[PDB]
């Protein structure tokens, strides 16, 4: 977790669960990381038990998530002075987007009773729009790099563990040692025994 406290300040480092600094003490089963970019005014719309207009039609974080969001501001290849039409969002969706679900659609979404399935006009629009990721705009129009940490517990043996520090050698002086979870007290001397590699 030493590479998780740099790379620009995190706009929203406050968590809704286990502390980020306590993740080194506890080992976790699996981690889910999602990579997307949102606008500066869409940072506040994501919350446990709270949603906005853009957040309801997009990925939503429910009350029970076992994790939180860490987002920061960085503008190296995220903001374009001209056009930025690659990154898009959903603002006209069929229903509320349930968590842990995703959907892709490049086809037009109707707004009335006429089925727009190949033709459009005044009463039919397109469900996607592009962000105004421009440096000449305001703070709330600036792009933000957003990642959400999701954890699943009590479903698999734990293998994604935190970092464990190490100390220096000691000789001929009894200490309170700890070797891979084996605790004890005693001297540390050179051994004439022979083991097997397992």
């Amino acid at each position: 977790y030493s590479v998780l406290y740099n790379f620009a300040p995190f706009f929203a480092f406050k968590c809704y669960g286990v502390s980020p600094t306590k993740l080194n003490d506890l080992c976790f089963t699996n981690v889910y990381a999602d990579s997307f970019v949102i606008r500066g005014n869409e940072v506040s719309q994501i919350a446990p038990g709270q949603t906005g207009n853009i957040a309801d039609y997009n990925y939503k974080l429910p009350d029970d998530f076992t994790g939180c969001v860490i987002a920061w501001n960085s503008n190296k290849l995220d903001s374009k002075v001209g056009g930025n039409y690659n990154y898009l969002y959903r603002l006209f969706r069929k229903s509320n987007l349930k968590p842990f679900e995703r959907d892709i659609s490049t086809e037009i979404y109707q707004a009335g009773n006429k089925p727009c399935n190949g033709v459009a006009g005044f009463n039919c629009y397109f469900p996607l729009r592009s962000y105004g990721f421009r440096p000449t705009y305001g703070v709330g129009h600036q792009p933000y790099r957003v990642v959400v940490l999701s954890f699943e517990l009590l479903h698999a043996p734990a293998t994604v563990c935190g970092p464990k520090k190490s100390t220096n050698l000691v000789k001929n002086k009894c200490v309170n040692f700890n070797f891979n979870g084996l605790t004890g007290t005693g001297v540390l001397t050179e051994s004439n025994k022979k083991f097997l590699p397992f």
Partner: antibody, heavy 126, light 109 residues
């Protein structure tokens, strides 16, 4: 901005030519450069775009290996190759500068062709 | 998916007329239709984008509109200085490229 062209000669079929459009005068990492050919006796054709910061392109179902598009960011100049010139290749490969990044397929719907400047003229003949 | 555009347009001056550029299924309607122009012996320019707003630098004579499969270009008044070669441009998801028709040539009657 300097959207001038590089001169090219007439070549018989069976060889390749070098066509270059100047991309200077503006920053290379945010504006896309498009190439549209105007051929008499038929409609215009558009084959594909580039991302002018890395290797990213998509080819339409009309040209597969005839046209190769490259990019250089050190001197901000782009070179294209036209091979096996024929009746279909008889067109003026215009240079179109537009806003947008366009590393995906859905970007092209919201994007319009901003400025056309100094299309290179290519004559196909033995 | 090839755009159908008439080769010659019979537009009489002094009265409005609308020309149609129709495509096919999943070619017009899923993506917008764009209107452009080019002078013979000169670089092309932009006429109408998105069929919603008229851009700056172009007089507000050509109307950007689309109704169903057929794309209708509406004009208000004809001038001898505005006989430029109009063109029909559209984006196709089934081709991943810009599709162009034959092109309209406008001659004063």
């Amino acid at each position: 901005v300097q959207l001038v062209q590089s001169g090219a000669e007439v070549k018989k079929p069976g060889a390749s030519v070098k066509v270059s459009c100047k991309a200077s005068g503006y920053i290379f990492s945010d504006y896309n450069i498009h190439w549209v050919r105007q051929a008499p006796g038929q409609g215009l054709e558009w084959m594909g775009w580039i991302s002018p910061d890395s290797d990213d392109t998509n080819y339409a179902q009309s040209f597969q290996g005839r046209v190769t598009m490259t990019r250089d960011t050190s001197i901000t100049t782009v070179y294209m190759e036209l091979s096996s010139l024929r009746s279909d290749d008889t067109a003026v490969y215009f240079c179109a500068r537009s806003v947008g990044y366009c590393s995906l397929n859905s970007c092209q719907r919201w994007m319009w062709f901003d400025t056309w400047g100094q299309g290179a003229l290519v004559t196909v003949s033995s | 998916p090839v755009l159908t555009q008439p080769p010659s347009a019979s537009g009489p001056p002094g009265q409005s007329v609308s020309i149609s550029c129709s495509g096919s299924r999943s070619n017009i309607g899923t993506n917008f239709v764009y209107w452009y122009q080019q002078l013979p012996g000169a670089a092309p320019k932009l006429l109408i984008y998105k069929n919603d707003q008229r851009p700056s630098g172009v007089p507000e004579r050509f109307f950007g509109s689309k109704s169903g499969t057929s794309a209708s270009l509406a004009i208000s008044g004809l001038r001898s200085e505005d006989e430029v070669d109009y063109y029909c441009a559209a984006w196709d998801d089934s081709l991943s490229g810009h599709v162009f028709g034959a092109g309209t040539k406008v001659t004063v009657l």
